[PDB]
Amino acid sequence: IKQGIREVILCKDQDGKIGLRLKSIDNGIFVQLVQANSPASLVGLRFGDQVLQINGENCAGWSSDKAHKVLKQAFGEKITMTIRDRPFERTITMHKDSTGHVGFIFKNGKITSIVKDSSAARNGLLTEHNICEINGQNVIGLKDSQIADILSTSGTVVTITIMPAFIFEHIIKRMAPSIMKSLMDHTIPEV
C-alpha cells in the first residue's frame, strides 16, 4: 500500500469504456472493479483504491450512480483522477516453512484461523479478513483452490494484501459473483 495520493491520467478505449465500477463507502468513492486489458488496469488502478477527484472535482458524498454518470460525460481524450492507494487494506510479508506452508486457513477468500508456531502467527495475520491480492496479483473472485495454487507456486516469501471482511462485503455488495470471477483483472501488471 503506497504512502499517500497520486495522479492518474486515463483515456477511454475505442468503445468509450475505461473498465471501472465505483462504489460509495463512508461518503468516499472506492474502486469496486477493474476490468482486465482496460484503460483503468493500464494506468494501474486497483481494487479498494479511493478516488478523491475526477477531473479535479471532489467525489466526497457522491452516489455510486453519480460517479458512473460523471465518468460517462467526460471528454474522453484525457481524464485525470486523484487516487488514495487501497486505504482499507494492509500488506503482510510471510515466509513458507519447509512444508511450503505460511500457516493459515481461509474460506471464500476469507482467513478463518491462524496456525500456531507459523509465519502467519509470527506476523500477526488476522482472521475475518478477505484476501485482496497475493504478491501484487488481484485474486478477488478466484476459486479457493486457485488462491491455494497461487500460494503453492509463489516463492518462499509471500506478500498478502488483506481487508477487514465487513468492509470487503460492503464494497462488493451488488456485484455478480461471476463478474468477480470473469472480469476482475487478475493479471500480473505490464511494463
Side-chain angles (χ1 to χ4, degrees), residues 11-169:
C11 212
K12 287 181 163 146
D13 70 10
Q14 293 163 286
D15 313 328
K17 292 176 175 148
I18 68 181
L20 216 50
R21 295 281 281 175
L22 295 182
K23 182 99 176 63
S24 157
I25 305 277
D26 299 336
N27 289 282
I29 295 283
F30 290 85
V31 177
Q32 179 197 68
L33 248 167
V34 183
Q35 192 168 28
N37 309 300
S38 70
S41 50
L42 279 153
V43 300
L45 291 181
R46 284 192 287 304
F47 181 82
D49 279 342
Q50 187 173 356
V51 180
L52 297 197
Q53 285 104 49
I54 292 179
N55 286 321
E57 287 190 330
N58 295 329
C59 306
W62 288 3
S63 68
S64 341
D65 286 341
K66 178 196 187 146
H68 294 150
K69 189 153 216 188
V70 164
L71 284 186
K72 223 174 157 146
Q73 295 163 218
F75 283 90
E77 149 86 8
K78 193 186 187 184
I79 313 190
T80 65
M81 301 175 92
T82 307
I83 305 308
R84 193 189 296 281
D85 189 50
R86 293 176 290 168
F88 295 128
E89 285 154 84
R90 298 188 281 123
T91 290
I92 310 259
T93 301
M94 285 155 306
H95 311 287
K96 283 175 200 193
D97 58 9
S98 33
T99 324
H101 287 102
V102 293
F104 71 94
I105 294 152
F106 70 94
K107 195 179 187 166
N108 310 111
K110 189 171 87 167
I111 302 157
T112 42
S113 70
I114 315 301
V115 181
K116 279 225 165 150
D117 296 349
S118 78
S119 176
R122 273 189 303 281
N123 282 281
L125 197 55
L126 289 192
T127 57
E128 199 60 13
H129 280 69
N130 273 269
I131 298 164
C132 292
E133 307 176 8
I134 295 171
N135 301 327
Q137 189 151 266
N138 176 319
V139 300
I140 295 170
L142 297 187
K143 287 164 164 148
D144 286 342
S145 55
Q146 293 174 284
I147 286 161
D149 277 342
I150 292 173
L151 276 165
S152 268
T153 62
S154 185
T156 84
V157 177
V158 182
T159 297
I160 301 178
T161 298
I162 64 171
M163 178 183 300
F166 194 55
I167 301 172
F168 185 83
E169 288 301 323

Side-chain angles (χ1 to χ4, degrees), residues 163-177:
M163 178 183 300
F166 194 55
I167 301 172
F168 185 83
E169 288 301 323
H170 186 202
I171 282 177
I172 70 171
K173 273 212 124 178
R174 308 301 199 285
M175 169 172 49

